[PDB]
Amino acid sequence: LATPSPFDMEKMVWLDVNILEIRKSVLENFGVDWSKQIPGPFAAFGKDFV
Amino acid sequence: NFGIITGVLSTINFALSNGDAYLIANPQLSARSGGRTDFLAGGQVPILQAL
């Protein structure tokens, strides 16, 4: 003849979360940049024998 | 008419270059025996894919 409870009291849990993040960066760009491909010498010949 | 008209052309190259790159990645994880753990440190990019 016994009856159950409507529900059961459960234990309550607290959650504490920490997220920590650090980013660092350095960027350098220094010097002199020259050309690497330049025109070279040329030669041409042309004649009319007849 | 008998003859010829011809010549040559040229280019000069003196290019020189180096490159070095280093990296270490040290992820760490915790998980229980019989469980699974996933970890992602990075990002997401959008991709246009469809059926």
Side-chain angles (χ1 to χ4, degrees):
Chain A
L1 291 185
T3 37
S5 308
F7 60 89
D8 297 335
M9 263 288 249
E10 303 275 355
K11 296 170 169 173
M12 285 264 318
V13 187
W14 186 278
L15 189 67
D16 183 17
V17 182
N18 294 271
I19 304 127
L20 301 89
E21 203 224 35
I22 292 180
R23 298 174 183 262
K24 287 202 183 76
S25 67
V26 196
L27 164 60
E28 331 183 346
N29 195 15
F30 58 102
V32 180
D33 184 35
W34 300 85
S35 287
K36 300 300 159 45
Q37 215 169 30
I38 65 177
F42 56 79
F45 180 77
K47 208 193 176 180
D48 269 352
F49 308 97
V50 187
Chain B
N1 195 195
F2 175 52
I4 190 174
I5 298 177
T6 184
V8 281
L9 299 177
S10 122
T11 317
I12 302 180
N13 297 255
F14 38 82
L16 181 42
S17 145
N18 298 273
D20 320 309
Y22 301 74
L23 85 89
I24 310 174
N26 193 14
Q28 275 155 114
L29 270 194
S30 201
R32 75 179 174 221
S33 170
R36 170 166 169 176
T37 294
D38 303 336
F39 174 49
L40 169 81
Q44 294 183 298
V45 279
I47 303 291
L48 205 61
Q49 81 82 14
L51 169 70

